[model samples]
Target: EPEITLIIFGVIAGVIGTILLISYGIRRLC
Candidate 1:
């Protein structure tokens, strides 16, 4: 198997965190 799984997951998880933060801010402001 390729060794890029860790890297892919890391990138996806990082972006997922931003989405949650954005959602929280939107809820608070709107």
Candidate 2:
């Protein structure tokens, strides 16, 4: 079977977005 490159991209994007959101919230708290 072949791999799905777009799926990987989507997963990476989700992870990066979550991390950014968490960091933003933490910064606001500080």
Per-candidate TM-score against the hidden true structure: 0.62, 0.70
Candidate 2 error regions (>4 Å): 1-3
Displacement of residue 5 (Cα, Å) in model 1 is: 0.6
- The digit string of per-residue lDDT tens for model 1 on 1-30 reads 768998899989989999999999899888
lDDT of 2 by residue, 1-30 (tens): 337777888899989999999999899888
Q: What's the lDDT for all of these models? A: 0.92, 0.89
- Model 2: clashing residue pairs? none
Cα error of candidate 1 at position 18, Å:
0.5
Q: lDDT value for candidate 2?
A: 0.89
